[PDB]
Design a protein around this ligand. Structure first.
Ligand SMILES: Cc1cc2nc3c(=O)[nH]c(=O)nc-3n(C[C@H](O)[C@H](O)[C@H](O)COP(=O)(O)O)c2cc1C
Ligand SMILES: Cc1cc2nc3c(=O)[nH]c(=O)nc-3n(C[C@H](O)[C@H](O)[C@H](O)COP(=O)(O)O)c2cc1C
Lengths: 359, 359
């Protein structure tokens, strides 16, 4: 079975092609993770997946999506991750972390608490920042503050500081969050970036924030650990061919700049779009990025059906398959998949206290 | 749905009728539990089950089944349980613990390490104790040492000390392990008890160890928390009618002595038997105990099929349904069951970080 072949990138070897993508839990306090996270991530690692990527973790307080997002903007935040990282490794999974800045989508409620921008006079909120003073709209109406050149320097450094802490906390895999309408995605897109300086206008200028952040992170992140990013390569906004072309060009530059793998997504930069949701609908897009940028990719959305994950791999649309929600429903999804695909001794996808009992 | 109605016993209210029965993990060192246990049990509680009973935990070093069994034979062992108990409560589940002494079945290997009595010159082994110097046979050939009256006093006190620690560590539910061929079961059965003193021979004498242990535990265990036990009511050894009669009589005495619920099992006292394994095969037996001793019961074996658990309840064969292995395969089995039985907003069987995403 292809889903259960190992995968080697730099010095890191995943035991199978199952990746658990970053999924926010909204359970942190002041950026600090706790026993929710520890048990959640520990449980997931024991489930069998080859790689577990920790949720979007803010490089700065204002870059949190919500008041419950994790953070890594201080050495104390980083140190909180240490036991969890060690528990993930103990379970045989590779610990990864996505580091992030939510840009104009920041200062919002938890999804079960309105999922919308925090009210003006709610003491939990904060001013958001972005390339340009334009609001997302819809449920996120707040107009962000336009970043100064010093803001841009500071955020870039926040990312470096974040990667450095991530490295020292023991993570073996890092993912830069340049997707889903957040800060990085918003610099690339013309919908959200109307800057007239070095960081807006042309393709080279809109790319600049993302490329510089990568290069600066590369300086602290170990050469021998996969350096990756997530990136919305299209919007389904009626400009897909041209957006894809530019996104693929940028992916080529990422690769040239040391990016080992690209997590391929949709931009979600603006609300007025028409996304053709469906099981593995991202496969064909992911496959085009892989071919044309000649770069390993993962993607997600509906791969919780084990045969679908298997086909994506055999067709070389993906190098790893990211399975999100199915892992929230069943932390042992990898075991479910092994059984479904007929893996020999499938119960030994799990640790011995479970495996012996289930064979 | 009956499986998802709450259940009140003394001052304790379970949020549904799903019980996770004690399942040994064999991951403790010198009786001390660790992060395996913490994450395992924490994960299970968040899964949705109303009650989570911690694995057979030894009241004395020699009463462990294996070198990896948990123990509660010192205040330090008990204190190790404290964080786990608090994590279980935080998740909305009721923390229970089964306290145990493996009798002649003690000093054995982990199931994936031979599952058999430890070799003579293996430094991990120890002498076993029992009512009479007779070996189980088969894979457990060691002849136990015949207990003195002082051994019996000491073990009884170990059980009291165990319940006391369990109480102080915060458990809200206790289960005495008088089943599966272990010490308690071995005092009741004529196959294993050939004593000619006050603790062997007649029904009153064979019952004595179990009844005294209960009464002594009752002295320290809070009146307002369910006091329960697990008990093999038959052997499938060709003596089932008479064994059942005596077992039911004992259950009546348990009830008269303060037992709030009885976990009904098979004795497993000897190997030469013919167990009619099948989905919910214990239902009819459990139901007879319930009727004739007029005592709430749970049982297990194959109730991981949600409709089977539901039927058992509607037919009043059981008051709680114990689901073991299915929870090792999927810690979120209760959520699986809610969906299968059509529970309204089934995803909210899980905590918000999962539930909101899965609705
Ligand atoms: C609760 C929830 C939280 C998520 N948090 C993040 C995140 O922090 N960063 C990110 O890139 N994607 C995040 N995602 C997107 C997922 O990584 C994944 O792409 C998505 O769930 C689709 O894959 P699936 O069908 O397997 O669920 C999140 C998704 C969900 C449902
Ligand atoms: C690994 C494993 C460990 C178990 N440990 C214990 C135990 O410590 N005490 C006990 O009474 N039963 C123990 N049991 C028996 C279970 O509680 C339960 O009765 C059994 O698994 C059958 O139910 P099920 O079909 O839902 O698995 C254990 C069972 C298994 C598979």
């Amino acid at each position: 079975s292809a889903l259960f072949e190992p995968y080697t990138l730099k010095d890191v070897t995943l035991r199978n092609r199952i990746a658990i993508p970053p999924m926010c839990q909204y359970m942190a306090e002041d950026g600090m993770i706790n026993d929710w996270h520890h048990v959640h991530l520990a449980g997931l690692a024991r489930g069998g997946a080859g790689l577990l990527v920790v949720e979007a973790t803010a490089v700065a307080p204002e870059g949190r999506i919500t008041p419950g997002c994790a953070g890594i903007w201080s050495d104390a935040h980083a140190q909180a991750f240490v036991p969890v990282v060690q528990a993930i490794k103990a379970a045989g999974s590779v610990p990864g972390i996505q580091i992030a800045h939510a840009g104009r989508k920041a200062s919002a409620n938890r999804p079960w608490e309105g999922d919308d921008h925090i009210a003006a006079d709610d003491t939990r909120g904060w001013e958001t920042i972005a390339p340009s003073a334009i609001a997302f709209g819809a449920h996120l109406p707040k107009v962000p503050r336009e970043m100064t050149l010093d803001d841009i320097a500071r955020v870039k450094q926040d990312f470096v500081d974040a990667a450095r802490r991530a490295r020292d906390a023991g993570f073996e895999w890092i993912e830069l969050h340049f997707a889903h309408g957040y800060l990085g995605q918003s610099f690339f897109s013309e919908h959200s970036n109307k800057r007239t300086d070095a960081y807006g206008g042309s393709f080279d200028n809109r790319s600049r924030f993302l490329l510089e952040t990568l290069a600066a992170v590369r300086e602290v992140w170990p050469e021998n650990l996969p350096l990756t990013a997530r990136f919305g390569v299209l919007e389904y906004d009626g400009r897909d061919e041209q957006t894809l072309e530019e996104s693929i060009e940028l992916a080529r530059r990422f690769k040239a700049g040391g990016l080992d793998l690209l997590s391929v997504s949709v931009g979600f930069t603006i609300p007025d779009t028409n996304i053709p949701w469906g099981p593995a609908f991202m496969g064909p897009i992911a496959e085009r990025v892989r071919r044309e940028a000649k770069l390993p990719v993962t993607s997600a959305w509906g791969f919780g059906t084990p045969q679908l994950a298997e086909a994506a791999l055999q067709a070389n649309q993906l190098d790893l398959v990211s399975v999100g929600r199915a892992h929230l429903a069943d932390p042992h999804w990898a075991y479910f998949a092994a059984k479904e695909l007929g893996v020999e001794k499938a119960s030994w996808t799990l640790p011995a206290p479970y495996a012996h009992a289930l064979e």
